[PDB]
Amino acid sequence: GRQVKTETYTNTVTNVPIDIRYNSDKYFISGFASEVSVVLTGANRLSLASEMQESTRKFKVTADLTDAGVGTIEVPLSIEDLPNGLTAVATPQKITVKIGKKAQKDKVKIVPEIDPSQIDSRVQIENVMVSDKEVSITSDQETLDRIDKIIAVLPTSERITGNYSGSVPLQAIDRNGVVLPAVITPFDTIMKVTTKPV
Amino acid sequence: GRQVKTETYTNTVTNVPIDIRYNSDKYFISGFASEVSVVLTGANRLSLASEMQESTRKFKVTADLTDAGVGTIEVPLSIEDLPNGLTAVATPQKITVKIGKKAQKDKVKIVPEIDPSQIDSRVQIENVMVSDKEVSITSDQETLDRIDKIIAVLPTSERITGNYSGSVPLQAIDRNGVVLPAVITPFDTIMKVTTKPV
């Protein structure tokens, strides 16, 4: 007759990527978290389980930027192809996007970076070679102007115990050393470290 | 008998989101482009067309961070559930991820930001109110320490022509005014602008 309490099940699906629609050849976007969490609710545990599993997942979280122009804006996320009998709420419901005009610039100032913790105590570095001498950077004009140096930083997991040769990622930083939102081509380079034993 | 030139078709699928697997409750990740492009190649134009269309797309680009620990690392992307008779190459093939320990901090220093271009010439701002007085920030400990102020920036598309009331996104910036990779809760706030006509 009145309002009765009923039994339903819930699950928060983590690592849900957003399918953002925009002209990636005219605009460059940044300033949002790549993945979200989706709170699913339903009485059917089986559909809830299959929708939680990436393999048998049918729902998708989308965002449309076609209407918007340049500048920073917040857009609402949409849940598409969600099976019937289920309720879905994205965490967060809206994302903040910085839409800027896609601009590119080439840089030759490629600096290798190695943390003294990665260098062994009984090893002394002689020379550091970087295979790529020129790189292309894609970003908005605002952050592109703020690029000071391109760095070929050694992965945190790697250690210099002697002569090293391996692929190191390339990052675009400003005068203060802040990693700027930019796409570098090539995305990595081969770093060769020559060492002398103390 | 020898090497003969054969006719095949190609299409670069843009706005392809990456399905990154990682413990989002223990680690915080940043420093990569949310979406990639996938170069598809095949003789069957029909399968190529349906795989280009988001609605009937079966392939997915994935990345696994479970093996890796803290620190910056580059991981290879994988193309899963790609239909037979097709070749797929992600652009870029590898992404650079900064894996840090998930840390949170609450801030009360919420500053509203309005660009003088958004303010009308015949209008003068009297008072600016922000509905939220306390916000929670989620990020790595490194960038969390670098947070100076939380800003309630007015969207670029919006204009102050009189008394305004609307949702404005919240951003975490450092002493130099750089938007830092962090998740703010609430993600936005209601900004109320009181105005006097010159």
Side-chain angles (χ1 to χ4, degrees), chain B residues 3-4 6 8-10 12-57 59 61-66 68:
Chain B
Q3 300 171 239
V4 179
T6 178
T8 196
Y9 293 86
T10 190
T12 59
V13 182
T14 57
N15 306 355
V16 186
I18 315 165
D19 196 311
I20 301 173
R21 179 178 174 89
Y22 75 109
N23 187 350
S24 59
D25 291 316
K26 192 178 182 66
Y27 306 100
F28 185 89
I29 63 167
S30 63
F32 53 87
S34 62
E35 291 181 331
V36 293
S37 292
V38 177
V39 185
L40 297 181
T41 311
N44 183 4
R45 301 181 69 178
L46 288 69
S47 64
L48 195 72
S50 64
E51 215 58 26
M52 183 173 59
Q53 177 65 27
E54 183 185 336
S55 178
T56 55
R57 189 180 303 175
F59 82 87
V61 57
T62 61
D64 189 13
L65 303 179
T66 53

Side-chain angles (χ1 to χ4, degrees), chain A residues 15 17-22 24 32 34-35 54 62 71-72 74 92 94 96 146 156 167 169 176 178 187-188, chain B residues 14-15 17-22 32 34-35 54 62 71-72 74 92 94 96 146 156 167 169 176 178 187-188:
Chain A
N15 306 355
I18 315 165
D19 196 311
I20 301 173
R21 179 178 174 89
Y22 75 109
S24 59
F32 53 87
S34 62
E35 291 181 331
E54 183 185 336
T62 61
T72 181
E74 62 169 356
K94 299 180 179 181
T96 305
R146 295 222 304 168
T156 310
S167 299
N176 302 134
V178 183
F187 49 87
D188 62 356
Chain B
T14 57
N15 306 355
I18 315 165
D19 196 311
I20 301 173
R21 179 178 174 89
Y22 75 109
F32 53 87
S34 62
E35 291 181 331
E54 183 185 336
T62 61
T72 181
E74 62 169 356
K94 299 180 179 181
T96 305
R146 295 222 304 168
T156 310
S167 299
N176 302 134
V178 183
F187 49 87
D188 62 356

Side-chain angles (χ1 to χ4, degrees), chain A residues 22-57 59 61-66 68-100 102-104 106-108 110:
Chain A
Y22 75 109
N23 187 350
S24 59
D25 291 316
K26 192 178 182 66
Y27 306 100
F28 185 89
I29 63 167
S30 63
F32 53 87
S34 62
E35 291 181 331
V36 293
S37 292
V38 177
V39 185
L40 297 181
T41 311
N44 183 4
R45 301 181 69 178
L46 288 69
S47 64
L48 195 72
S50 64
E51 215 58 26
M52 183 173 59
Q53 177 65 27
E54 183 185 336
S55 178
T56 55
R57 189 180 303 175
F59 82 87
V61 57
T62 61
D64 189 13
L65 303 179
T66 53
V70 292
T72 181
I73 192 177
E74 62 169 356
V75 288
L77 301 181
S78 298
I79 302 82
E80 297 182 13
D81 299 323
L82 179 78
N84 299 329
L86 295 182
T87 299
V89 183
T91 304
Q93 296 81 314
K94 299 180 179 181
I95 63 168
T96 305
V97 183
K98 179 188 176 182
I99 310 169
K102 189 188 186 68
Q104 75 83 52
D106 287 18
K107 286 196 69 64
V108 291
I110 307 166

